[PDB]
């Protein structure tokens, strides 16, 4: 039914057609969660090497 | 070998379709969560339609139409009929109905506006709720709904039903309709009348064994007297229509049934068709009608998961396999249905 | 430029390892000299995975040859491709291991193991980005079995974040005579469950059945068995050696193939099966597909129908229709779906390379992680118990310093592995 | 004018980006060497195409793009291919070894060793931006890098550039072309961790694309090249408003305002028409009605799902070619009567329309026929949640037995991140259900 906001130019045009109306972490906490994971890796590798040394 | 799974154990009908398929030796049943099926016989709630049609190398089919619940719940049905122009408020063959909510959208106001032109006509002012009750008084029903919890429907009661003699009895008609993946609408030639076994009591509504014709509520309250199980089939009732009223089933009743069936299902076709979709649906419906003394047929409700009557399982379940399933998935190497089609030109 | 280091140990290891280098060198157009004489650029695009470059535009296998006796290494040297190997990468002792795991693992092999690791380390240092190691060996002798596992353990100590992959030859009394083989094998399996990421079970039982029943070779030799082993090794390493999407490195293969760290023992399969003899007809895609999944095509003597596939990789080689491959692959899963665990969705992956293998227009290689491999482990386990319950032949091992406890731990771990596969076969 | 930086991450992001920048070049008549005759302001400008390309004194137009992959093979192909001079080597960043289809290895393990270099390379571009609006990020959900590194990048971009907008182009996993069985795990993990950092994301299901190429381009077995040229057409269609004179969707903020009223529910469905084989000898050109109607066919959607059984919250149509508003409104009127199009009670049933008269440019010798008019519909419908349910069920199946989990724990991630990612998706599935269904 109702056309609105008709905007023309050389490239094209644009408009809106309405048929009916209605009815964050810090650079710190990041660098930390990355480093707890690297710790957990390092520990797991350490447990292996210790096992291999036995 | 075609593959299938079963996810409703309580389905009288899909139990029988299971066995019919296994017995072909061309279908293997898989465990119910194995996703590499051709056919899903699905659960009743929350059937995961979103997971169908995403297994490459498998054409997949399911025994329900998504969005068919709009026809198959009472609240939904009334909403559908009023709002859809193909049907409309003008619609002749559905009893005047209204959707009513507990006060814990609504159309209570609009219910009373029609009630109080039957207290300004003194004419038949009997209604019915949705565990269910029939009154003439409004505030005995509204106070019943609020003392219940769910959404309900208030419907004109047919004070003047067709009564079977011998017995001055009340009945309803169940017809079974299979809509295949192509949206061919197939009516099973065998229907069934689910009868009352006690004289219809004009002036006393509480004695409910005579007003409600459900197969159980007769079982659990004369059951069996005039015919087996309060079940009269089509040969008998055609005969009775001939002898007693000089008409036929086909002419006095069936044209209307076929018309109401097509109208309902063509209405929702655009919303539920699976024609361009990546899985395919079929579904068996149970349509239930009421016949007034004039021989006018009324739509009562639609059931999305009907059970069949005993005599007829054998035949109907085979018909499903024939037209719903092996038309998608052929084997190597009479029709029990009437196809409902009509292209009038105007 | 993601490099693999290859080690081959003991008689069996060196024999199948030499045959691998013959086969792939040819596929990549490298000759005994080490000179490229190929006619395609696809042969050279990931050549550095297996070969180092040298002055002269020469390609030198990144291969370490190891044995406790000189015998087979002279065999490799005087062989066809013998000249291609880096001479200082031949590490060998004098005394042998006498089919005794304990000698391989603890006494004779300790003496030689450090020199092997110097050569390994030097090869790892000249690596732009090392992906890990592949080792070839039998499990039923002493050097491949006992020293090969010692190596694996020492290599993991120095490169714990690299992938370790074996081609491990499993023994059978249909082929071999020596009564302590189940001992050496059980002890080796114990190591492999703890210290490899991927292990290809190459069962001599199955290689025998294929050669004898199916290929009608009534006088089968190791050459025949090895002809099947090399085909399969060519096929499982195709995705590593040529440009491709799927399983293109060891770590990707492992992530795709190993849902639980201990269940990393694969059933390889190959089609078409042949003896070293002319193939007159190329197979069709449906034939490859059916055959590669056939029990009779497996290089481990297990019935796939007795288990369930956890994961699968499939590799097709040759000029063929990708559509028809896709269709047939799907047809297999959809037609035998109960065989594939349903709690790993889309557990079958499929690669196609255009360069076919030598002497075949069409081939297909199968790699299965199936619960049915338990049958292989139960068979070794039964042999082991029969002797061990009377401590028979143990003095060969106690005399090199081992305690019985160590045998009880190996049997136990291997029995545990079998019940873990059983656990996932019923889940 | 306000600049836009594109970031292409992992093989999928990089190869799709390739195809986009190729297409953009052709669209704006920029040559492989980066010269644009039609640009008369040598050495600068604030024209509409400059949102994506910057200029040099030498007359060179260079994408405001950074490509990152944790292995080099793929980006090497950009480095030596037909567009080598287009980019400055500092925009092409590679590692030695990839994330092996492991979210956790791309996020935690290899991410850490390369995040700072990527940010520094991104800042070099932001420092040439007079008024940067934000970022367009391209990646797969299923790859180790595409999932894991993208999600880390997005966390960091919220920190270094809080006020700025971030849009994604995300490739949703499909077994017909997927390379890893753990794609579902990765896709949930990165969606969990990227959700708060993304203003608007356009998902493309490889399954949907693969079938469009089979069915409509008669390509028996589509390659990434086939898929990526088609994806770049859609992408071009969506970003044309940013590179061209017009009044619809002229800045990144406007995408969010026009398409995303509820922030978590930020996944608009793309449907595109028409897709026509260049090999098709004889072709009857389709009308405005025909292509507009086709935007409501699931088979043309970038994600197969069924908008009939869900509700809309916003709907744009982006036309290219011989289209005038009269024809659009007539097509919409007809369609509104033939179809199930249900908005949410709190939203106008309505469409926003963008027309650009220049028809779709097509890549020469490609699969797609040049056509007189095309359209891309962006509808935010609740039906797109069907794809979340599919992915979530696969995840539940494997996670229930902890299959493959050890690979992720091994890289330092904790088992609980899995169940936490999945609780977020279960909540997302619920938001979509609240909004989209009644009874
Ligand atoms: C592939 C390697 C192989 O060549 C495989 C077999 C064994 N050896 C050496 C070759 C060989 C074989 N037979 C030999 C007899 C004397 C000297 C050498 C051999 C070999 C063969 O070519 O047969 C024609 C062979 C051997 C056997 C062999 C088969 C076979 O080649 C067909 N058998 C499967 C076993 C055997 O134990 C068995 O169970 O056979 C039923 C078999 O017993 C029999 C035939 O009664 C036998 C025969 C010597 C008994 C002692 C235990 N071993 C274990 C291997 C088995 C053998 C072939 C290595
Ligand atoms: N559409 C499309 N999808 C792709 C492309 N490349 C990969 N994919 C898909 O993305 C997933 C694989 O992720 P990739 O982008 O290749 O992974 P990556 O980001 O390089 O991650 P790693 O290799 O794990 O470091 C699968 O679903 C592929 O089908 C592409 O070029 N186009
Ligand atoms: N407006 C009306 N006029 C006359 N009878 C009515 C009526 N509404 C309901 N009934 C009676 O009540 C019976 C059962 O009602 P209804 O079909 O609404 O409930 P239901 O869903 O539990 C049984 P089914 O699932 O088999 O249809 C009908 O068969 C009919 O006899
Ligand atoms: N397939 C195969 N098996 C072999 C070969 N050589 C030996 N074997 C098997 O390996 C076992 C003997 O091990 P071997 O490698 O000779 O001992 P090692 O030299 O001490 O490692 C037995 O199972 C043999 O059947 C071979 O070339 N191919
Ligand atoms: Ca000594
Ligand atoms: Ca300029
Ligand atoms: Mg020997
Ligand atoms: Mg990658």
Q: How many H helices and E strands in chain B?
A: 10, 15
Q: Where are the beta strands (DSSP E) in D22-151?
A: 53-55, 61-63, 65-69, 92-94, 134-140
SS3 of residue C159 by DSSP? coil
Q: Measured between alpha carbons, how far is D117 from D95 in angstroms, rounded to an integer? A: 11
Same domain? For B111 and B166 the reply is no
Token pair listed for B243 = 């002898």
Query: Which CATH class name applies to C1-259?
Result: alpha beta
Token pair listed for D145 = 């890098």
Chain C positions touching A45 (Cβ under 8 A) are 160-161
Same domain? For B118 and B78 the reply is no
Domains of chain D, first to last: 1-268 (3.40.50.1440), 269-383 (3.30.1330.20), 384-439 (1.10.287.600)
Spatial CA neighbour of D97 closest among D115, D83, D109, D84: D109
Q: What is the CATH number of the domain that holds B40?
A: 3.40.50.11480
Spatial CA neighbour of C64 closest among C1, C3, C118: C118
Q: Measured between alpha carbons, how far is D111 from D116 in angstroms, rounded to an integer? A: 9
Q: Measured between alpha carbons, how far is A18 from A13 in angstroms, rounded to an integer? A: 17
Q: Measured between alpha carbons, how far is B14 from C266 in angstroms, rounded to an integer? A: 42
Q: Pick from B14, B45, B63: which residue ends a domain?
A: B63
- Angle, helices C148-158 vs C181-195, to 10°: value is 10
Q: C226 among the known binding-site residues?
A: yes
Same domain? For B115 and B79 the reply is no
Q: Which residue of D has its CA nearest to A44?
A: D410
Is the separation of the CB atoms in D173 and D206 below 8 Å?
yes
Q: Which residues contact D49 (CB under 8 A, 6 or more apart)?
A: D28, D39, D61, D243, D244
| Contact between chains at D410 and A44 (C-beta distance less than 8 A) | yes
Q: What is the CATH number of the domain that holds B108?
A: 3.30.1490.20
Same domain? For B104 and B167 the reply is no
Buried b (16+ CB within 10 A) or exposed e, B141-177: bbebbeeeeebbbbbbbbeebbebeebebbbbbbbbb
Is the separation of the CB atoms in D359 and D371 below 8 Å?
yes
Q: Where are the beta strands (DSSP E) in D332-422?
A: 349-356, 373-381
Q: Which residues contact D374 (CB under 8 A, 6 or more apart)?
A: D237, D272, D273, D274, D291, D319, D320, D321, D359, D360
- Cα–Cα distance list, C241 to B78, B147, C59, C246, C292 (Å): 68, 75, 14, 12, 21
Residue from the list A11, A15, A22 with its beta carbon closest to the beta carbon of D244: A11
Same domain? For B55 and B153 the reply is no
Chain D positions touching B75 (Cβ under 8 A) are 439
Residue C207 CA, closest ligand 4 atom number = 1
Residue from the list A15, A22, A41 with its beta carbon closest to the beta carbon of D348: A22
Nearest ligand to the C-alpha atom of residue C70: 4
Where along chain C do its domains lie?
A: 1-259, 260-372, 373-427
Backbone angles phi, psi at C120, to 5 degrees: -65, -55
Q: Measured between alpha carbons, how far is B95 from B78 in angstroms, rounded to an integer? A: 10
Quote the ligand 3 centre to B145 CA distance (angstroms).
Answer: 17
- Angle, helices C222-236 vs C10-27, to 10°: value is 50
Same domain? For B212 and B71 the reply is yes
Q: Which domain holds residue B4?
A: 1-63
The answer for B17, left when phi > 0, alpha when psi is -120 to 50, beta otherwise, is: alpha
Q: Which residues contact B128 (CB under 8 A, 6 or more apart)?
A: B134, B154, B155, B156, B157
Q: Which residues contact D197 (CB under 8 A, 6 or more apart)?
A: A24, D154, D155, D157, D158, D166
Token pair listed for C275 = 């003896």
Q: Measured between alpha carbons, how far is D255 from D270 in angstroms, rounded to an integer? A: 13
Is the separation of the CB atoms in C314 and C350 below 8 Å?
yes
Token pair listed for C335 = 């037609």
Q: Is D16 in the pocket of ligand 2 (CB under 6 A)?
A: yes
Q: Measured between alpha carbons, how far is B205 from B137 in angstroms, rounded to an integer? A: 12
DSSP one-letter code for B164? B
- Cα–Cα distance list, B225 to B308, C371, C374, D307, D374 (Å): 21, 63, 67, 53, 70
Nearest-CA residue for ligand 4 atom 27 is C12
- CATH number corresponding to C260-372: 3.30.1330.20
Same domain? For B40 and B133 the reply is no
Nearest ligand to the C-alpha atom of residue C18: 4
Same domain? For B153 and B178 the reply is no
Is the separation of the CB atoms in C64 and C119 below 8 Å?
yes
Q: Is D63 in the pocket of ligand 2 (CB under 6 A)?
A: no
Nearest-CA residue for ligand 2 atom 10 is D140
To test the ligand 4 pocket, which listed residue (C148, C169, C220) has its Cβ within 8 A of the most ligand atoms? C169
Experimental structure resolution, Å = 2.5
Q: Measured between alpha carbons, how far is C420 from D348 in angstroms, rounded to an integer? A: 59
Same domain? For B10 and B127 the reply is no
To test the ligand 1 pocket, which listed residue (C138, C169, C171, C174) has its Cβ within 8 A of the most ligand atoms? C174
Backbone angles phi, psi at C222, to 5 degrees: -65, -35
Q: Pick from B136, B159, B182: which residue ends a domain?
A: B159
- Cα–Cα distance list, B59 to B47, C298, D207 (Å): 18, 32, 15
Is the separation of the CB atoms in D169 and D16 below 8 Å?
yes
Q: Is C143 in the pocket of ligand 4 (CB under 6 A)?
A: yes
Is the separation of the CB atoms in D227 and D213 below 8 Å?
yes
Task: Report yes or no on chains B and C touching (3+ CB pairs under 8 A).
Answer: yes
Q: Is C169 in the pocket of ligand 4 (CB under 6 A)?
A: yes
Count Cβ atoms below 10 Å from residue C78 Cβ, excluding itself: 9
Alpha-carbon torsion angle D166, D169, D170, D175, nearest 10: 180
Token pair listed for C333 = 């899963």
Same domain? For B89 and B221 the reply is yes
Q: D11 among the known binding-site residues?
A: yes
**Looking at the 3D structure of chain B, how many domains does it have?**
3
Q: Measured between alpha carbons, how far is C259 from B49 in angstroms, rounded to an integer? A: 29
Q: Which residues contact B100 (CB under 8 A, 6 or more apart)?
A: B106, B107, B108, B111, B142, B145, B151, B152, B153, B154
Q: Measured between alpha carbons, how far is C168 from C373 in angstroms, rounded to an integer? A: 14
Q: Count of alpha carbons within 13 Å of D256, Cβ hemisphere only? A: 18
Q: Measured between alpha carbons, how far is C23 from C357 in angstroms, rounded to an integer? A: 9
A46 to chain D, minimum CA–CA distance in Å? 12
The answer for D295, left when phi > 0, alpha when psi is -120 to 50, beta otherwise, is: alpha
DSSP one-letter code for C336? T
Instruction: Locate all alpha helices (DSSP H) within C162-249, ordered by sequence.
Output: 181-195, 204-209, 222-236, 238-241
Q: Measured between alpha carbons, how far is D310 from D381 in angstroms, rounded to an integer? A: 7
Residue C219 CA, closest ligand 1 atom number = 22
Q: What is the CA radius of gyration of chain C?
A: 20
Nearest-CA residue for ligand 4 atom 6 is C12
Is the separation of the CB atoms in B298 and B155 below 8 Å?
no
Residue D170 pairs with which residues in a beta bridge?
Answer: D139, D203
Q: Measured between alpha carbons, how far is C365 from C271 in angstroms, rounded to an integer? A: 6
Is the separation of the CB atoms in C297 and C291 below 8 Å?
yes
Residue C174 CA, closest ligand 1 atom number = 34
Give the number of B-D residue pairs with CB atoms closer than 8 Å.
Answer: 42
The catalytic residues of D are 254
Residue B187 pairs with which residues in a beta bridge?
Answer: B177, B338
A contact chains, 3+ CB pairs < 8 A? C, D
Same domain? For B7 and B71 the reply is no
Buried b (16+ CB within 10 A) or exposed e, B45-76: eebebbbbbbbbbbebbbbbbbbbbbbbbbbb
Is the separation of the CB atoms in D411 and D104 below 8 Å?
yes
Q: Is B53 in the pocket of ligand 3 (CB under 6 A)?
A: no
Alpha-carbon torsion angle B214, B216, B218, B219, nearest 10: 160
Q: Count of alpha carbons within 13 Å of B163, Cβ hemisphere only? A: 16
- CATH number corresponding to C373-427: 1.10.287.600
Spatial CA neighbour of C411 closest among C373, C390, C383, C369: C383
Q: Measured between alpha carbons, how far is C186 from D300 in angstroms, rounded to an integer? A: 58
Angle (CA) C307-C417-C262 rounded to 5° is: 95
Burial class from Cβ neighbours inside 10 Å (0-12, 13-18, 19+) for residue C12 reads buried
Burial class from Cβ neighbours inside 10 Å (0-12, 13-18, 19+) for residue D193 reads buried
Q: Measured between alpha carbons, how far is C122 from C115 in angstroms, rounded to an integer? A: 11
SS3 of residue D368 by DSSP? strand
Q: Which residues contact B30 (CB under 8 A, 6 or more apart)?
A: B3, B4, B5, B36, B37, C337, C338
Q: Pick from B109, B126, B159: which residue ends a domain?
A: B159
Q: Which residues contact C348 (CB under 8 A, 6 or more apart)?
A: C309, C311, C312, C313, C314, C329, C332, C333, C340
Residue corresponding to tokens 């009421």: B290
Interface of C with D (CB under 8 A): 2, 128-129, 131, 245-247, 249, 251-252, 255-256, 258-261, 311, 321-323, 326, 342-347, 349, 424, 427
Cα end-to-end distance, chain A, whole Å: 82
Q: Count of alpha carbons within 13 Å of C69, Cβ hemisphere only? A: 17
Q: Measured between alpha carbons, how far is C15 from C73 in angstroms, rounded to an integer? A: 9
- Check whether the bond before B166 is cis (ω within 30° of 0): yes
Same domain? For B85 and B226 the reply is yes
Q: Measured between alpha carbons, how far is C339 from C347 in angstroms, rounded to an integer? A: 11
D contact chains, 3+ CB pairs < 8 A? A, B, C
């Amino acid at each position: 039914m109702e056309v609105i906001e008709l905007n023309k130019c050389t490239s094209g045009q644009s408009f809106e057609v309405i048929l009916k109306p209605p009815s964050d972490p810090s650079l710190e906490e990041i660098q930390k969660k990355l480093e707890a994971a690297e710790e957990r890796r390092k520990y797991q590798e350490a447990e292996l090497l210790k096992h291999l040394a036995e | 070998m075609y593959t299938f799974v079963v996810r409703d154990e309580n389905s009288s009908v899909y139990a029988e379709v299971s066995r019919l398929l296994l017995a072909t030796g061309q279908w293997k049943r898989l465990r119910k969560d194995n996703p590499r099926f051709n056919l899903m016989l699905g659960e009743r709630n929350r059937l995961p339609f979103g997971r169908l049609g995403h297994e490459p190398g498998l054409v997949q089919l399911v025994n329900y139409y998504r969005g068919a619940d709009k026809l198959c719940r009472k609240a939904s049905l009334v909403k559908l009929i009023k709002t859809s122009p193909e049907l409309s408020e003008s619609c002749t063959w559905f009893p005047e109905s209204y959707v009513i909510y507990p006060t814990n959208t609504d159309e209570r106001e609009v219910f009373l506006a029609a009630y109080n032109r039957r207290r300004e006509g003194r004419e038949g002012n009997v209604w019915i709720a949705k565990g269910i009750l029939i009154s003439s008084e409004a505030s005995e029903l509204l106070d019943f709904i609020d003392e219940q919890g769910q959404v309900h429907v208030i419907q004109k009661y047919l004070e003047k039903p067709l009564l079977l003699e011998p017995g001055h009895r009340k009945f309803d008609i169940r017809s079974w309709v299979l809509v295949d993946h192509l949206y061919n609408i197939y009516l099973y030639r065998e229907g069934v009348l689910r009868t009352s076994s006690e004289p219809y009591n004009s002036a006393n509504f509480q004695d409910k064994t005579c007003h409600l014709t459900n197969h159980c509520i007769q079982k659990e309250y004369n059951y069996g007297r005039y015919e087996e199980g309060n079940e009269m089939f089509f040969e008998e009732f055609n005969q009775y229509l001939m002898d007693a009223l000089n008409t036929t089933l086909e002419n006095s009743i069936l044209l209307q049934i076929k018309h109401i069936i097509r109208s309902c299902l063509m209405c929702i076709e655009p919303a539920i068709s699976t024609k361009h979709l990546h899985y395919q649906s079929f579904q068996l419906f149970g349509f239930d009608f009421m016949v007034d003394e004039e021989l006018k047929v009324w739509l009562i409700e639609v059931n999305g998961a009907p059970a069949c009557a005993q005599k007829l399982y054998a035949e109907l379940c085979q018909g499903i396999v024939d037209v719903a399933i092996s038309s998608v998935f052929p084997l190597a190497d009479t029709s029990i249905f009437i196809k409902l089609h009509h292209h009038h030109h105007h | 430029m993601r490099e693999i280091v290859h080690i081959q140990a003991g008689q069996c290891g060196n024999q199948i390892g030499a045959k691998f280098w013959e086969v792939i060198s040819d596929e990549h157009g490298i000759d005994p000299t080490g000179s490229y004489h190929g006619d395609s650029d696809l042969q050279l695009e990931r050549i550095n995975v297996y070969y180092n470059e040298a002055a002269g535009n020469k390609y030198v296998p990144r291969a370490i040859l190891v044995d406790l006796e000189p015998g087979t290494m002279d065999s490799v040297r005087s062989g066809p491709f013998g000249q291609i190997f880096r001479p200082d990468n031949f590490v060998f002792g004098q005394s042998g291991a006498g089919n005794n795991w304990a000698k391989g693992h603890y006494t004779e092999g300790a003496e030689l193991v450090d020199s092997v690791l110097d050569v390994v380390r030097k090869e790892s240092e000249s690596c732009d980005c090392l992906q890990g190691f592949q080792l070839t060996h039998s499990l039923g002798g002493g050097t491949g079995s006992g020293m090969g596992t010692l190596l694996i353990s020492k290599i993991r100590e120095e490169y714990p974040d690299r992938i370790m992959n074996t081609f491990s030859v499993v023994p059978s009394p249909k082929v071999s005579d020596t009564v302590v083989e189940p001992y050496n094998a059980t002890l080796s399996v114990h190591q492999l469950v703890e210290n490899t990421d991927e292990t290809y079970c190459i069962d001599n039982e199955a290689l025998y059945d294929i050669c004898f029943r199916t290929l009608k070779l009534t006088t089968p030799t190791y050459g025949d068995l090895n002809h099947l082993v090399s085909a399969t090794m060519s096929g499982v390493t195709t995705c590593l050696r040529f440009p491709g999407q799927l399983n293109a490195d060891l770590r990707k293969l492992a992530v795709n193939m190993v849902p639980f760290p201990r269940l990393h023992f694969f059933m390889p399969g190959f089609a078409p099966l042949t003896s070293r003899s002319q193939q007159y007809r190329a197979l069709t895609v449906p034939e490859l597909t059916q055959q590669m999944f056939d029990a009779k095509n497996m290089m481990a003597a297990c019935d796939p129908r007795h288990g369930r596939y956890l994961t699968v990789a499939a590799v097709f080689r040759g000029r063929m229709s990708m559509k028809e491959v896709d269709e047939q692959m799907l047809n297999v899963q959809n037609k035998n779906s109960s065989y594939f665990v349903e709690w790993i969705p889309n557990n079958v992956k499929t690669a196609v390379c255009d360069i076919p293998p030598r002497g075949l227009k069409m081939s297909a290689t199968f790699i299965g992680n199936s619960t049915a491999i338990q049958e292989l482990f139960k068979r070794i386990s039964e042999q082991f118990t029969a002797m061990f319950r009377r401590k028979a032949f143990l003095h060969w091992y106690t005399g090199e310093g081992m305690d019985e406890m160590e045998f009880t731990e190996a049997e136990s771990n291997m029995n545990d592995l079998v019940s873990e596969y059983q656990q996932y076969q019923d889940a | 004018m306000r600049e836009c930086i594109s970031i292409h991450v992992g093989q999928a992001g990089v190869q799709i980006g390739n195809a986009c920048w190729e297409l953009y070049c052709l669209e704006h008549g920029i040559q492989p060497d980066g010269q644009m005759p039609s640009d008369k302001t040598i050495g600068g400008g604030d024209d509409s195409f400059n949102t994506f390309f910057s200029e040099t004194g030498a007359g060179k137009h260079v994408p405001r793009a950074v490509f990152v992959d944790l292995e080099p093979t793929v980006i090497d192909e950009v480095r030596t291919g037909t567009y080598r001079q287009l980019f400055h080597p500092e925009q092409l960043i590679t590692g030695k070894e990839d994330a092996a289809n492991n979210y956790a290895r791309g996020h935690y393990t290899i991410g850490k060793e390369i995040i700072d270099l990527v940010l520094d390379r991104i800042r070099k571009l932001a420092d040439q931006c007079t008024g940067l609006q934000g970022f367009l990020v391209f990646h797969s959900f299923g790859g180790g890098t595409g999932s894991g590194f993208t999600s880390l990048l997005m966390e960091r971009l919220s920190v270094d550039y809080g006020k700025k907008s971030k849009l994604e182009f995300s490739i949703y996993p499909a077994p017909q072309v997927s390379t890893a069985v753990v794609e579902p795990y990765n896709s949930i993990l990165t969606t969990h961790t990227t959700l708060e950092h993304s203003d608007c994301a356009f998902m493309v299901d490889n399954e949907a694309i693969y079938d469009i190429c089979r069915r409509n381009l008669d390509i028996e077995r589509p390659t990434y090249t086939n898929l990526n040229r088609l994806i770049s057409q859609i992408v071009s269609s969506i970003t044309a408003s940013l590179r061209f004179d017009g009044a619809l969707n002229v800045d990144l903020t406007e995408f969010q305002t026009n398409l995303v009223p509820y922030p978590r529910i930020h996944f608009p469905l793309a449907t595109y028409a028409p897709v026509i084989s260049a090999e098709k000898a004889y072709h009857e050109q389709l009308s405005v009605a025909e292509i507009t109607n086709a935007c409501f066919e699931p088979a043309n959607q970038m994600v197969k799902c069924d908008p009939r059984h869900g509700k809309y919250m916003a709907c744009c149509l982006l036309y290219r070619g011989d289209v005038v508003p009269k024809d659009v409104n007539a097509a919409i009127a007809t369609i509104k009567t033939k179809r199930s199009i249900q908005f949410v009670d709190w939203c106008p049933t309505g469409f926003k329309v963008g027309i650009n008269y220049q028809p779709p440019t097509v890549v020469p010798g490609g699969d797609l026929a040049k056509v007189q008019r095309a359209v891309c519909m962006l509808s935010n419908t609740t039906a797109i949640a069907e794809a979340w349910a599919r992915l979530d069920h696969k995840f539940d199946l494997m996670y229930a037995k902890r299959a493959f989990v050890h690979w992720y724990v091994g890289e330092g991630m904790e088992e609980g991140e899995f169940s936490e990612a999945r609780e977020d998706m279960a909540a997302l599935e619920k938001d979509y259900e609240e909004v989209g269904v009644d009874s």
